[PDB]
Write a structure and sequence with these properties.
Largest interface: A-B, 8 and 8 residues
Number of helices of chain A: 2
Entry title: CryoEM structure of human S-OPA1 assembled on lipid membrane in membrane-adjacent state
Radius of gyration of chain A: 18 Å
Number of strands of chain A: 0
Strand content of chain A: under 5%
Oligomer: part of a larger assembly
Shape of chain A: elongated
Largest sheet of chain A: none
Chains A, B: Dynamin-like 120 kDa protein, mitochondrial
Structural class of chain A: mainly alpha
Keywords: GTPase, polymer
PDB class: membrane protein
Helix content of chain A: over 70%
Order of helices and strands of chain A: HH
Organism of A, B: Homo sapiens
Chain lengths: ~50, ~50
């Protein structure tokens, strides 16, 4: 119980730092996982094919 | 055997007519099924959220 409280606060702070870095570097972008990036990449490829 | 040959030619001609209609109406677009349209629609929604 004592350990998990400390870990939860540390994890929340760590996640906040990661989010702050994302905003500072990529404020106008959206975070996507590996699968979603693959879907976005293929759609762009199809657009270039049409263009 | 005789019937399937006639059907295959008719199906090919019918598909050609559908493709010709697609080009005449939507030359600069890509045909997608119901599922793919849902994926495209949600991505546009997320873009508007960011904008």
């Amino acid at each position: 119980r004592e350990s998990v409280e400390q870990q939860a606060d540390s994890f929340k702070a760590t996640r906040f730092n990661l989010e702050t870095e994302w905003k500072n570097n990529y404020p106008r972008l959206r975070e996507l996982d590996r699968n979603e990036l693959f879907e976005k990449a293929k759609n762009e490829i199809l657009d270039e094919v049409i263009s």
